[PDB]
Symmetry: C4
Subunit: 290 residues, 4 copies
Amino acid sequence: AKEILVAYGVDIDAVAGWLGSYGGEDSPDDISRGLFAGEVGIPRLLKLFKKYHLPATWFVPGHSIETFPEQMKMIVDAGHEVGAHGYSHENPIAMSTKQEEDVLLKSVELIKDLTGKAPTGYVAPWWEFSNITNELLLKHGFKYDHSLMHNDFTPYYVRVGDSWSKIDYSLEAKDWMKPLIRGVETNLVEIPANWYLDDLPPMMFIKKSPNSFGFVSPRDIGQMWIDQFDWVYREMDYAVFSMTIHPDVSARPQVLLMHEKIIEHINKHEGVRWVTFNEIADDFLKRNPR
Amino acid sequence: AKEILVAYGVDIDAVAGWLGSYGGEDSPDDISRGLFAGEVGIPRLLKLFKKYHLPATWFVPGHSIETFPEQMKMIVDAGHEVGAHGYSHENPIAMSTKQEEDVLLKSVELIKDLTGKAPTGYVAPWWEFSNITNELLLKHGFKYDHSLMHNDFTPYYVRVGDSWSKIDYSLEAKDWMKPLIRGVETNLVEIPANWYLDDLPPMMFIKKSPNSFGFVSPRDIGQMWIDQFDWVYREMDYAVFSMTIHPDVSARPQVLLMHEKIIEHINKHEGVRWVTFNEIADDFLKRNPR
Amino acid sequence: AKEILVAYGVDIDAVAGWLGSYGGEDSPDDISRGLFAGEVGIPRLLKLFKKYHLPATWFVPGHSIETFPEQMKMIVDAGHEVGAHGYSHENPIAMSTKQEEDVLLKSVELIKDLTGKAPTGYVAPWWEFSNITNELLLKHGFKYDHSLMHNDFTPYYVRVGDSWSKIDYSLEAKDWMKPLIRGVETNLVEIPANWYLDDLPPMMFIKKSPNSFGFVSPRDIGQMWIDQFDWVYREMDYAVFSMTIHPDVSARPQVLLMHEKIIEHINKHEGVRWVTFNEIADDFLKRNPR
Amino acid sequence: AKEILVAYGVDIDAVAGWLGSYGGEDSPDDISRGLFAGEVGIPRLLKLFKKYHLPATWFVPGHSIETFPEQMKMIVDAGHEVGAHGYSHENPIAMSTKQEEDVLLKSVELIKDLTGKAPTGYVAPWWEFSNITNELLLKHGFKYDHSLMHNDFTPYYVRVGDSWSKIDYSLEAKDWMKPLIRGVETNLVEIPANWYLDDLPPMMFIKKSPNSFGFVSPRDIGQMWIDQFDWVYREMDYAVFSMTIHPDVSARPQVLLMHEKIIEHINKHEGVRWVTFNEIADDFLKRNPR
Ligand SMILES: [Zn+2]
Ligand SMILES: [Zn+2]
Ligand SMILES: [Zn+2]
Ligand SMILES: [Zn+2]
């Protein structure tokens, strides 16, 4: 028996992505791409999904919620899930605890006002943590996170309190020669992030980044994503296969075609189930409690 | 039912590009590559266009006009359109108001003395704005710009006055948790620039930039460009599909071949119309006014 | 006659590589990747190796030995070799001679404890030497190293005492215009490292490095690795063909697929012997003494 | 009819390149790649050329001469041409006038003692000039340089005295809004360098460079080189098609294979003539004097 849970996760980075993460704060041109992502990118992603009758989870920065209100209505009315993703896409590790907690509070408030329900899902901007577990569980709603990478194609419960010894070369070796020390499992389910199922780093060009790419072939990317799916399909009976995309990138014509090949390849397989992240979190919590 | 407007926008970066944008000001070797683009590159692209009976718009830095006067004659005499592109490829955002204005004055004077008419088209060097909209409309002529990215395959009127709140981590979150505020549309038409339709960053090698590439395959890029065309053709009845190239890069034999594949593919389609950017601007001004 | 010795060398970088080399010491997201590599990665490479009945050598950081004890047990039970690889993946050049010596002792202590025998093989973290060659022979055990690049498909005896003159542009040219002066062979066998046979740089994404890649296609790399083998099989009668992998990278489904191709292709060839690094070293020491 | 002059230019960077250009001066591991290039790389490229009965020019750093004397004898006895390439691959633009002149005097001295005749050919390390034109013509011998890029597939006489105005944003625009002023042709013939016909930047990995690559596919590079040859052959009656390689890179098995494909493709075409750079230079001097 094959139970393959498959989801698209859309991080609406848009203008917020350029303020917090990708260095576009003083660039009109970069800001204009942020606006493309919302005004042009969200609806093309909705048409793509509507075409294959797919559900999806949208992780939306508070900035994008208030900057693209008309497209936000289009997202809710399609019956899709809205999750959290900062306000202006700020990297949590760079914020104070109060700044991070305030950002999360505003996000919940903005999503609740938009959907009627509190968000249950989170993606940390640029995928970085801090004391986020404690904050997510504390700020109610939050059932699951899609930011961490302890695993691949299986959800798990996130541990709080892991520690490790950093190398300090001004000391002697015995001071840092100690093994990572595992913390304690919490109720936050992880639906793992994955750089190999992330449209943005290979296919978006960023001048302000030393590790920007942007000109990797979408056919090579699609093919790689598809090889990942085939392997998962061949090796695992239950699995979650989630793809992280951004209207910024995946609503560009060349990678829209890529997604059509991916979806159409996945749909050739029996035992596939297109779902939202909340449904994965619900199913996993029911699959193995504790 | 198909009206696909298709154009080459040739930015004659040549030497100007290396003085203003690409860090070659102290490199005899980079400077000589600049001379290749003017002396060798302009005639090879002209031969390319003549072969397929294509029109084109050349956006020429004042530096290139005065450094390659004989190649300039070849561009005019072929009946192609000439637009502005700085003098020494200066990034507008680093310039003063007067410097940027002076640059713009000189560009206009030079193109007028060369062609007989004032330019109607502008490309910002390295695609960066500042307060350019206002200057383009003030310095007469300028009908259209090809620097911005609010859209990809549909022109639009450029808004002046968009504002946004930068993240300041020395303050509290509420100080930057505000949306982008849209300004007001001017009569400046935008014929969108697109990093995904720009020969230079993937296929020009630059020692002085850490986000240089240069060795992305021209067959992949061409295939990507054609995929962009095919999606546009399948989804839209009216569209403008403009390609930004440089003699620097697109006059290298391996990408001259690439363009031949592209042009021959585009030419298989009904409803294609090869045009200048000015013709797109005029056609757009007539299509939807205000 | 053909004797083609083929081997997999697994550097279990994991959490250690992020601590020592890849900038992830202040990143919960990167540490999470580290733990993937050890908890999921290690058993998937074992399933692969066992699928083709292959031996392997695992060059294991002390930090990984102690952080992943259940996976260590699994490595020894399968009968694979365990070589040394620092503790927290520290660069031998950044360390005091005492730190370095203390790192090598603790490694040796940990591996003996685990296996019953002292290690005979070493890989230097991030592939650098310093005064290692003396320390490796001195710390008894060590027969062979797999860090250096004087050759590629033939082992050789590591020379000690090589020196060269650096360019100081403050002085005159005659002060630095001198050749490299070769030292003297030692008994340390080199089983050469090779950037062209290393899964990590092309295919792990790292933001903390400007020299990072991550999105080079695994199909392109697999092809390039087979091409290397294809030339070798055709041009040499005796050869060693070792591939450096990491559970970090080679336990990702798309790279596992890559390896399956590489392995099956290599098994079409007769004269091929799948061995451990210790067996290559032993072979070499028999092949040509002194 | 068809006279396509085709040559390999082998720059023996080896250890010199790591001292002078690629940041390996403090790296035992990089130095070993340097030694690989000389000890293993030169003979493999000699076996390659001999197989197809090809002549070649080796542009050899004095550092490589004195460090690989036995391989230097192999290059001479194979009857190939020897040109200059710095001592420790030093960038001319970084050197004093005296250092650069001293470096050049020593190179001439070493090459003469090695071959019997003074060198006629020069490649600037890392391809940069300064006041080299004057020194190459002053330091007798030197007939041709292969460092500059004013053209790609036609030789030319190098101009001395080119000048241009740099951008200084502390002044007004009119201060720098002036064209490049061409100087005057000298007798130095250029057989152009070309980043698109250079094996090293796409396929050698350099940790010290932010602009390093190293993992671009050799099949893509080979295909790109064959596309260049195919266009030149289709478009030109007389042309020089010279390829720059390094034992460092092109003596790697995956790239030897690439070259075999390249050479075999070129040999199918009529009018091809494999020559040394010296023969190209002489042919050019005879083709058009002045
Ligand atoms: Zn995001
Ligand atoms: Zn430009
Ligand atoms: Zn390692
Ligand atoms: Zn060189």
